[model samples]
Each structure stands twice: as structure tokens, then as C-alpha cells.
Target: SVVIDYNVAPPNLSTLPNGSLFETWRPRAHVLPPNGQIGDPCLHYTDPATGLFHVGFLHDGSGISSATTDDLATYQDLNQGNQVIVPGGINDPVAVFDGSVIPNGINGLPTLLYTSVSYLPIHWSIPYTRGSETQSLAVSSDGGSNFTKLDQGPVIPGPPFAYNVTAFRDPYVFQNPTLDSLLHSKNNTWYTVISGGLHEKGPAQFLYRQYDSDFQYWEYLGQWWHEPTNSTWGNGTWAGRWAFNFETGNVFSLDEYGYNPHGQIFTTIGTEGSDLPVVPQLTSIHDMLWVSGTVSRNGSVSFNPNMAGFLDWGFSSYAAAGKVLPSTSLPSTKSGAPDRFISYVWLSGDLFEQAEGFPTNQQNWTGTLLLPRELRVLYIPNVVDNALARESGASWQVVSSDGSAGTVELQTLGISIARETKAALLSGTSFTESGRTLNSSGVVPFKRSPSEKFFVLSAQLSFPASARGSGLKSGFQILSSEHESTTVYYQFSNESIIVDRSNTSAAARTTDGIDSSAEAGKLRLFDVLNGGEQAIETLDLTLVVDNSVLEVYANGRFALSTWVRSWYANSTNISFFHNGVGGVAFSKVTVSEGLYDAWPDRQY
Candidate 1:
């Protein structure tokens, strides 16, 4: 099953069968396996010779796969010809999981840091000794096309480290520039951050260590960081444990002395996708958090713990590799930008992870990477300073051609607006009317500062059913300028939720409506109409608006994603409205602006 064809490349867009416009949901330039599943990207290196970026990742049951890319947009799979590492080795029997690569920086030889695990007959029983799992190393001199195992066994033997856990895997190695500055040592050191689930359950504890110059030995540093207590997430000390279970996925950081010029630190922690009761718990699905903190030279990080937020609020984005992009790779204005951290997050189980009613011939692929997102730091006025004042009871403004006029009752955590207008024009033509209350056409909008480009806004809406027994068709609308807007709402008539981007731009009207019904379990109206007529409680809608892309998560169960060519410019606006007479009540609306520019411009 192995082909050493040097010409083996990814299928071009013209060669692939024409598919859904929804493919737009996938990044136009991100990396996707030629077929099957891939996960936990490791070892992102740039060949100084050709200026091409090399990335290594797990190819599910297949083995470790590596590819080369010049622009980060288009990638050429190395195949067996270029795929230096494959499965079925003494260390990688089942398959290699999470690992990282480091170049010699001097000779350009590549060293791979990977995890190898052993399973027993019982299957569940893992080991604390060398038999269970171990971290190993492989070296490649011929441009990573081939590698030689460094040792017969693991480079860093087995479990029993100071920070031990049931599962100890996914080794991410990076060289920190400040190590010398902090340690005041003459020898340069390399560090690896490994994921460990403490006590075999609960939150994940990431452990760290430093390697000797010869790359022969490692010294245990201790736990990097663990789950924090967040009242915002309903995470409280339930008799001393994370009341809600969560674990950390691939970990990376932006050191001030390294890639960033800022004195502040930015670290990203990954969360597996899961479910939460009222709010929700992190799932095995990929979810990442970008946290701001301070890193000491001694390899110690002091995170503002509370200042952390999702790297991407959607379910699919996870296990990211943030690297510094080359200066020529970025825009002109960002030239002086230090290592710009271009992040490549793992995208899996898109809207159709395990859905039941999908098309039988559905073209399904598992893991992929999101479009490389350039992370930058943008500070807004009084966000952290005035948290309490805004949380207490911020008034909601109704936006329209008429001056702001609407009745919104502000509560401790959410807001409820009574329906006023009987009918109103939503996207130039679509009509939104209320049978129970007043009918209006115009939308009731709210305003944040004009400068904000990326943010996380979540609101809980208690949907009111219409006369037809369908759930109300109402949700949030994102507007750019006044004419261009995208409405993400429940389509009661079809028992589905629609991301209507028709009016986002002049050409956007041709873009298909991204629907929830296309995927299973998203359209709750199916149950509501089928006599399982339980009163619809609430629609928890979370919108992660990053410029033109809108990722909306509903009730923590389903997500609808779309990109608009129209809504790109700033002066963006957020508004909420009910499309039908059934008035929807907003239980809560919380907005937190996120930090994007975490690395220098060269890191993308």
C-alpha cells in the first residue's frame, strides 16, 4: 500500500468531483488528507534550503504523514517517496499519535519527537513502564523524506515522571530563546510540552521538560498549567475537582523574548469536544483557547488564567500548530511584525461527525486544517477593567433607520426584548412578523466599538413557538456597514436553522443558505413538529465572528459555519431579532473580544 512515487501529489480542484458549495465551510487553503482521517499536527519546520514549510501529522491507522508547502495555502503531500516516517515500526505498532519535529538549525537535519504506545489484551490497561508508552526520536537528513530512529527505545524512557498521569503522550518540542536569558546559561536548551491527564480523569495537566544539548537526555520541569476556576464557565470547586471534566490538547505558547515583541505572553491550550449540561463541557472535538499571560525566563508561565478564551469558538477547530511565518509571506504593513504566529488548527467532524441521516453517498472526510489564521493582539478600551459594570445590566439598543427605540429588560447575565414591530424587511425582502405581539420589519441591533474585528458573543434565547407549531425563526444577525448583513436564524418552516448569507454582498446572494437540517440533530424543530412537542426551552447561539467568517454554535450541540465575501470591512455590527410573531427571550448575552495577533508576522 506504499507508493514511492515522487510525483504523487494532492488531487487538484479541477480533478475532484464537483461537491457542495458548503465546501466553502472548509478553508480554501488549509491542509486536508488526500483521503481518510488525520489528527494532532506535529513537527512544523521550514527547510532553509527551499523556503518551503514542512509539516508532520498523524495519518490515523495509516502512519505519520508529512507534506511540504511554499505558501501555506497549497501543500504537496510527500507520499511514500517523500513520507519519511510510516507506521508499523518497533515503536509505532498501532500508529504514531502526537509528535513534534525540530531542525538542527545548523546542519538542517530534522529531529522528530514522537509518542509510541503499547496496548495489552485487556485493551484498557496502559502501562506506567516502558511497555505501555514512551516518547522517542527520529532524525532526517535528506529533507525529511527519510528518517532513522535515534534509539532502539524511547529517547525519554516511560511514565513515572514527576507529573505522571494515566495517559502521557503528544510531545510538542520547541526551542525557547529566553531559556538562556532566564537560566543565564551558556548552553541553549530545547523544551517539549507533553499532555497528561492527571489521576486518569478530570482536567488535563500539561507537563514540560528541557533537553540536553546533545539531545540525549531530558529534565522534568513540572506541570506547565492546569484547568482554572472560571465562574463564567460554571466551573467551580465541586469539593476540589473540576465539577465539569475537561482535558488539554496540543499546547503552544508565544514567548515575549521569542516571537513576540510584546512583554505580555500568549499561550494556547486545546480542549477536546464534549457536551455541557446547561452551559456545556469541552468535547473531544477540537476546541482551543488563546490565553494571555507572562512567561519567565526560567520556563515558568504566569497566566491571567481568567483572561483565556477560545482560539476558535467552533467545534471543528482544535490541536493547532502556531508557527512564525516568513516576512515576505505577510502583508506590507505587518513587515516589522515579529514572528507572526500563523496558526493551523485541526478540523474534524465538521457538522457531520456522526450524524445519522446524511446522504448515503455523502463525500465524507475526517480531519483537516482550518485556513491559516494570522494571530494578532488588539486591545479594546476597558474590557477587563469594567467587566463588572457591563455584567450588571448593560442596556440593549434597538438599531434601525429610526432612532434607537425598543424595550429591553436587562438582567444580571442576559437580556429580553419585547416584540414591537409586526413586520419588517430583513434582507431587503424577507419578512419577519410576530403573531403573538407587534409586527416589525426592521432589526433590533446592538453596538460594540467599531474597531473590534474578532470576538465571541453567546446568547441564550428561549424560543417561542408559532401558530404552525414550528419553533420561532429568530437569532443573531451580523452586519457590516448598513446594507450588508448575514442572518443566522432558525428556519421554522423547514425545521432547520439557516445561515442566510444571501445579502452579505452583491455576489453573496448566489451563495447557498448554510442549513442545519442538512446535518442530523441540528434542526430541533423536527422533534417539535413530530408530536415530541416539548416546549422549546432555549436556543443557545454562540457566534465567533472573525472578519468574513462566521462560526455559530447552537445549544452546544450543533454548529453552522459559513464565509461571506460581502461582510469583510469593519464598522461591523451585531443585532438580534425574531423573524416570527413568537417572541424569543434572550436569557443571556455575553461578549468578549479576542486577541488574534499572538505571533510575529513571519510565523504564518
Candidate 2:
């Protein structure tokens, strides 16, 4: 049994919204659709003036349920009473905010479009026949608080595109921004895009398009998107999910990142050379955001990571988020084009299950919520395409390696740490070699030496200019076990390093950020070392030297400064991490010759 400490979380309400609510329902599957399964989660927008967010999704409880979040932080379940948006008859919805047009003779509030699948035998007799899938449009006169369906013709036909076989469920609808702006409104120019699954063997996922301005007809845009891949053409990994677009943020295309394996019960039987839910080394699964590109022409876009504009990384965002763009609008910075798609991700790992576990021991809903990060278009020189490709990165050389620290390989626990932090383990591996595919991407783990009473390790590295964007950054972690409090690791940033002693079930180390504080520990800024220097050139740093002094060199030209008698001491072990993105490379690493007798000052 995995041990866990209840002391990690304070008794007070968590700062995160909805963190207090425990899910009590055990859903056997997404939907109990008499014929198939359900489980597609999608979001919708609400008009701000009236403070309502129109949400749409599939499954029971209205065959749908909508929640209202005015501040995007708090939500009230509108599953009952006067505020019901989808009403009792509808479910499995996808809506768009029509800022330009009004619906049902109402002016200004956003309109909605959706699809629902129904098959009942009694009302109309047809032998083993599935009822036609109905496509619809509705308007909300009182914002998204209420809606009424318009008599618009069936957006898509029944049978083929609508009937049976993962056919006709999630409906993603969006109006083309370009056409909506330039084309004559009266001349019928609104274009609509739809995404869904098809009946053919591998035809399970795809998006189709059509345009209607006059409400009289729709022009087919053919296949808007098919599953995207870098290697094999159709391994069926992209068996598509739900896809949609948003106008204000310009984010589009999303799918349920899917689930990780559950019970230990394994099926030895093979279905065409594959066991059920075949996974990576029989490990628990991870739900990842599978996405594509995104950008709007003439219309501007911006990415706010701190989430000041949007909620930086919060309940409102999806993990692995990127947008599908126009392709022409590339960012003037960065190498790769922005990620314009997203996948709702979840994991079944012990850490996640413990942190996000639902009440009543539910499996499907127990997982972590990776905050949605937005990507922007950049005119990045194709690093994957040019001579400076993967092979161009500087190679690693073993400056020194004595005795195995006797720890698990970094690659084994790769999922928890970033590739850069694990650099020491991926010695001799080429940068061009995709770390995601090759498990040879990170540094080997360092174990505590049994003979040592205290430990200190430091390295001198040259950080490259190209690798440093505006600033440089890296990551590091100390080994740990379950039930361990995370405070024991001694950590330091470029300026300040702190010593944590409260929690000690596992290895302890410093981490990123100017100030990383926890409930049990106090947070303070370490005084700056080389004040007022642009990180345009390489610099040298001496992290841990015995217990007395730490030295830093500048561009190999001058000895910068030094500090003494900090946390680390003799007979102790400590490790460091430098991510390659900033060209932070350690050319020399050495244990101390003992503390400096006197302080070393910076030289001009």
C-alpha cells in the first residue's frame, strides 16, 4: 500500500475553486445510451453583461448539465429549476456565441447550435431502424440563462452521417471569422464547421464544414481536418473526439485526452495482436491534449501565461492546449508554430489519484487537471527542418563520474521531471533525438552516499546566448517517496537558496522561481548576486562548495562574487540541474576543497 500524509494540505479551504466539492457519483461509463457509450466534455461561452456562461456536454442529468461561472472562479449547478439552459429534452450540446446575429427574433445575446441522438421504437415503427440524428440551432434572449430552438432545417442529414457506429454525437460548430467580416451579411456568407465520428472502420474521427448566410442552404467545405500524425499514416491513435472553436480567444479543436487503465486484471488474449487497452509497459495511463494549429487573420491574438487575461493555469483551462490556426499568421518569435488544439487530460498514477481522488472511490474522475496553456504563432526557423536540427545541440561529456549514487535511473521517473532537469542522465544523446519517444532524454538519478554525513555538489557551466530567450531557466528535484513531506530538500535559485527540514519521507531539493514557499515554510528572496546584468552572454556559477563559500564567474573574464556559510556542509550530497533551452551547460563540476577562508568579492 502506498503511504500518504494527510498533513500536506491544511485544514482551511484550498485556494483553488471547486477544490472543496467531492464527486459522489460513480458513473459506469460516460452515458448509458441504450446503444452506445458517452463521455465527451466541452465548454461554451456566456455573455458577460448578464453574467452567464452557456456550457454544453454529453451524458445523463439532462442528458446534459450546465453550470454558471460569472467570475470563472465560482460555479453554481443549474441542473434544476428556473435557470435550465438546455431544458429537459436536449443533451450532447456544442454552442457558439454569435456576437453578430440574434436568434429567435431576439437582439444581441449569443445563439447556440447543437446535435442530439435519439432512438425510440414506439412512437414510429421501423424494424431495428435507428432514428435520424437531429442537428439544431437555438437562441437565448436572456443571455444563456434560457434558450429556444429555431426551426432551422436539419444541419446534417440522418442515416450515414447520423446513424449508429460512434456516429452522430458531439457537435462542434463555429462561424468562420474571415468570411463573417468581409462577406455581405444579407448575401448569405456565414460559414459553419462541424466535427464528429464516421462509420467506416478507421473513419471514427473527423470534422466537416458548411456555410450558410441566407438560412436557405449550406455549402459543403469537405473534410476540414483528419487525425494528424508525424509518423505512421493511420495507426488509429487519432481516432478523433470532439472539436470546436472560440472567437474571442481564437482557441479551437479539442478532444477528451482519454483515460488510463483501471483494474490489475489483465487480458492475456489478443485482439489482432493487441491486448485490451494496450499501454506503455503495462503502466497506468495518461490523458493528453491532442491538438493542432490555430490563428485568425487580420484579427489579433495574444497569449497570457500568467493567466492575468484568462485564468493563468486554473480550473478554466485544459492541459496540453494549443490552437489550430490560419497557418499564415506565424509568431515572429520562437521556433515551432503555436499549439492550437487541446485535449482534456487525466492520469491514474498514484500521485494524481491521491491528489485528485474523488470521494466514494470513483476511478474515471480521479486525476490531475493540467492547466490549459495557450500557444501563439511564431516565425520560428524550423528547428526540426534546418541544419541546426537535433544534431546541432552541444553534446554532453562526462566531466567526472565516480561511483554510482545507487538510485533509480532518471529515465525511469521521467514523467515527473522535465527533460532538461534530467539532462545528466541522457549523456551522449542527441538533442535531435526526440526525448518523448526515446526514453534516453534525462539525467540519471543520484542517490545518497551511505558514508556521508552531509553532501554538497556544484558545477561551472557556460550558458549559450541562443539558448537563452529573454532570460534563462532550469529545473531540479530531489528523490522522494510516497507519504514524504516535500520540505526536506535544500534548494536555491540564482539568487536565494533555502533549507527545508519539516518534511522528510523522501529526498529534498530546491526548485524553480524567485520564491517557492509552502504552508509549513516561510518564503523570502535571496539577495541578487550579479545585479543588473542582461543574460545575453555566458556566465559561470559555483553552486555548492563545502559549507563555506559559493563562487560565480562572469564570461570567463572576471570572478563575480561569493557567499559563505550557507546551508550545505561537509559529508553531504547535493545535485544540480540546468535545462538546455537557455544553453545552460556545465563544463566543469567539482566537489569542494573545504570552505573559503575569506569571502571572494566581484571584480569589474
Candidate 3:
């Protein structure tokens, strides 16, 4: 029998062939296993010769799998549908969950830091759970196609004996010199943040260190950061909301021109079990949120989390993992720009299916890795000094916190499709419309050809405060036929981007499982927030569609990643509409198609 931990795992669905979307969702420039389930798409390592990114992921009920890709638009599976690291090896008998990778870590070979869960549950924890979570190492000589355990035991082992841990898993590793200089010798240490929660303290990330010479051994340092259930961080919204436990906690930095411009640390974490009584829109038990701030090392290393927001404006995007694109391989890297950090988050489809009484992973595939997103620091200094105050969370408010006459740089995280991927996909361009006003009557006519189901549509528009701010919406209706459609649009009233799937699947629209509630996130233009003139601000939007998958990104900071499968094949029409009349001018709009399959020869 396969290992199934009821406390942390879903009950096994029928292995029966209920129905399948393998053919439907596949055949695109997306990365996924040939069958079954997948989770925690992670960055493993890069090929030294070709510079392709080697990504590691959970192969559902089996083990860890890896794929390689340079552009997020397309991928090459390294193991060809087989797992590189299987379960029941030594350290990971029950489950091999999530981890990271580094090149030249040991004797100039690829080294993997991974999570291994035991078969026996922790004595104090739930009975049905698998074993206690721990960290371990695996090494590969053949470019990550195969790996051998560095040792037969856990590297860092369980949480420090001093801390009271309620949950533990998902280790994220990165190199930080400032931290190394303070904790160990300068630039002579390795750091990792393990996701877990203390019984007394709500959720936290435990910090650990290792010398470069000894890769297999690690010493538990103090926590990188911790939050109680009531910890609202900068008046309740700056760090998003607190959760009972943190999973897949990832850390990185943008040192120059970032929020602090000196190692501006950003953490994107998957959260479970919110302490809030009432659920907030887009705030769900399984979701990814972010916090960006300065990390200082006084005695114990601590992160000053000042800015916070949702990684995506949807309930589905969760458990993100990423790595820095090689500087020489990127666009700006050739022009003195720093290496860009990018991530691929697992798009969970099970919850959406269960909401409507469908079998879990009924389609034989349950997860999708969202298009790779490039992460950066976004900020707008208070140009108009005391003229405006900033709102916390998604609404990046420019606050002169002291009511003084000085400028303040309000910071937030900005996420978008990887630039190279966006450019390559956009190369398959359809016609664009510039300076066109979209009113209730301004209907757009565009439809996907049978072969061109993979589509991208985006617009740069100007909104007028006087005309469109009264809760008016202007956006697209994609994957539409006579009976089914998904709506992606921008609203001026609350300054947010939304994806409404209420009308999806014509026959199921009225069913009990169809969700009427939309996935949305807030946005605001700091520089030109409703100037004296009627013009509000110029806006940007991008929408990418891949058969059953749909994603919407607003400006450069807000996004909504979700899945909406229509029952009809004729759901191919594309159109645009607006509630206001003779306003919402499209300054520049682009529509595109044709992304080559990631693994065209992939046989499912």
C-alpha cells in the first residue's frame, strides 16, 4: 500500500479512470508530470554547460521530479516523466516533500537540500500523520537526472530541541552575505529558512547555518522571523495576516534600488489555518502571501517586515519556489542589471473541484505550475510630500509617516511573467489597438482558432476618475461561447483587478459547486492618483490563457492565477467590454497566440 498520512494528506481518490484532461491541459508550453498528482514546483539547479534551469517538484504519490527550462515559456523534463529521487530510500521512507538545489555545493557537483517525512508520527502530534518532518541532502553527478543521498540521515534534523514545534516542512536555502558576516565569517556561511510553527508562537521560519566546507551538517540558529496569531505587523495589514503554520517559506533579496536598496529581503510563504474569525476575500487557508523588509543581525538574526501583500489575487495559487535567472542569460543582465529572481507557484485545482462535488484530481491530473513569474521590489516615493497617505497591504500608500515635509518610499512586491517568456510568447502577435475607448458599446471581436487556444491579451489604458471611479469595470471576456465564459477586468472604484468565473461551464453555472465570488487584488497609482484633471491614472493589464488555465496580472504588482475549465470546446471567443460610456481609453493593447509545446513529444 502507498503511504497516506490522513492528518496532512488527502484521502486516496479512486484510481479509476473517471475522466482525464491530460490531453486538454497538456500540449502547451507548461511543465507537469505525465500523470497523477504534483506539488511544490521548486528550483533544483542549473546545467553548467547549457545554462538551462533544472526545477525539482513533488511527483505526487511517488517522489521528487526535475525539469529544465531557460525561458518559462517552454520546458524540458530531465527524467522524462520518471522521478529523479524516489521515496523509501533511507532518510525519507514515507514521503519526500519539498526542498532546493545548488550547483558545485559538494566537490563541484550538484547538491540537493530536501524535506523527508518519516512513517511514524510525532508522539505529541496527530496520530494519523506520517513521520516527523526533517531535512536531508542528496547529490547528483549526471546533471540532476539522478541523485544519491549524501548521507543516510537528516542534515539539520527536526526543530531545535528548545522550540515547541507544531508543524515542520519545506526548507528554502539562499546565500546572504550580510547575515553571514554577522553570524559567521563574512561570505563564508550558508543559510536556510525552514518552514514551521511554534506552539506558543503562531507561525515562524527557523534559521540554520552550514559552513561551505561541510555541506552535510548544519547548526540551528535562531528564528529568521515569527508571528503570533494577533500579530498584524505595522497596524494589521503590512505583513498580510498571520497563520497557524507557515509552509514553503522562501527568501531572497534585491539589494540595489529595492525597498531599502541594501539587501531588501523578501519572503513569499504558503500559509495554513488563519486565526481570523471571518475569512477575507482572496485570503484562504492554502495561499501564498509576501513580506519585504530589511534584515538586521543584532544578536539573533531578525527581519523587519514592513511591506506585505498577496503574491496573487486568487485562492488557488500556493507553495511557490524560485531561483535567480543567470545574469548573463537575462535581458537586463547584459546591461548591468542584477540577476532577476523568478518563481513558479503550484496552482492547486483540487480545492476548486471539491467546491463543486467533483472527485479529487478527477481528471487524472490535479496540479499546474503557473507560468514563471519574475519578482522585484516596487515602490513609489512620496513626490507630493504630505498631499496623500498610503494604505497598507495591497494598496501601497505613500505615507510621510511623521506628517513632516519629507519624501517616503512606499514599498511593495511586484510580480509579472518572466520577461524573456513574455517577450517570446508575445512574439506570436495578433493585431493591437492603441488609443481606443472601450465603452459598454465598444465590443471587441477576437476569437481563438482551434490550434491557437494558447492566448495572451494585455492593455495599457488611461482611466478618468470622474467617469470610471464609481465601481466601473473594463476588461475582457475570454474562453467564451454562447453559454460559457471567464471575465478578467480592472475596476476603478476599489482600485483592483478581478477574474470572475461565475459564467464558466454553461451547464454547471447554476450548480452548487460553481463559485460566484471572484478572485481579486487591490492596486493604486501613487504618482497620479486622480489629479486635478478628470484623468485618474494610466493602467496596465496582461491576461494569459492556456486551454483550461487562466491568469490575470494587473499593472506590475497584482495578479490572479486560477483554473476555469469549460465543458464546451467552442469556448474560444474573446471580447472586451466596459460598464462606463466613452471612457477607459486603451493607450496600447496587444493580443497574441502560439506558444510551442514545452515537451511536444510528451506521451501521457
Strongest candidate by TM-score: 3
Put down candidate 1 lDDT per residue, 1-604, tens digits, no spaces. Answer: 2222212322222223334212322222335565455676666776655666677666654557777765443456675423467656787665566667776632457778777766522111233343555788888777777767764777776645454454567777655544445555444467666665544443444445554566666676555555532222223110112222232243333432224433334555564433333222223334455554445534554323433445554444556666554454322123343455555666554332443332212233445655445554432111111222223211111112211221122111011110010000011121222222323434676644324445556677665445236445676676555556667776556545676655665322322322222221133321121232334435666665544455565543244444443423443666766765556666556665532321112222
lDDT of 3 by residue, 292-386 (tens): 76677777788877667778756777888877655654234433435777788888766623464444444666677887788876665433343
Q: Show where candidate 1 strays beyond 4 Å.
A: 1-28, 80-84, 105-107, 120-131, 161-164, 177-180, 183-188, 200-206, 228-258, 273-286, 296-306, 326-338, 350-364, 382-439, 442-604
Per-prediction TM-score to the true structure, in the order listed: 0.57, 0.40, 0.85
If the candidates were sorted by their TM-score against the true structure, best first, what order would they fall in?
Answer: 3, 1, 2
lDDT of 2 by residue, 1-604 (tens): 3222332422222222342322211111111121111223343443434434333333332433344433222234443313233433433233221111122223555555555444432111112235334455556665454565665455554434443332333344433333333333333234333333332331122223344443334444333333221111123222111221111112232222111111010000000111334432221212122222222223322111110011111111122211122212222012232222322221111222223321212212322222112222111111122121111111101122223321111000001111111122122212111111111223323343212211223334344334322233332222223332211211122221223323431112331111122211111111111333323222333222212112122211111111121122122333333333333444444333222111112110
Clashes of each: 45, 37, 4
Question: In lDDT terms, which candidate is top?
Answer: 3
True-vs-predicted CA distance for residue 102, candidate 2, Å? 8.9
For every candidate in turn, the CA RMSD to the true structure comes to 14.4, 19.1, 6.4
Candidate 2, 32: how far from true, in Å?
22
lDDT of 3 at 146: 87
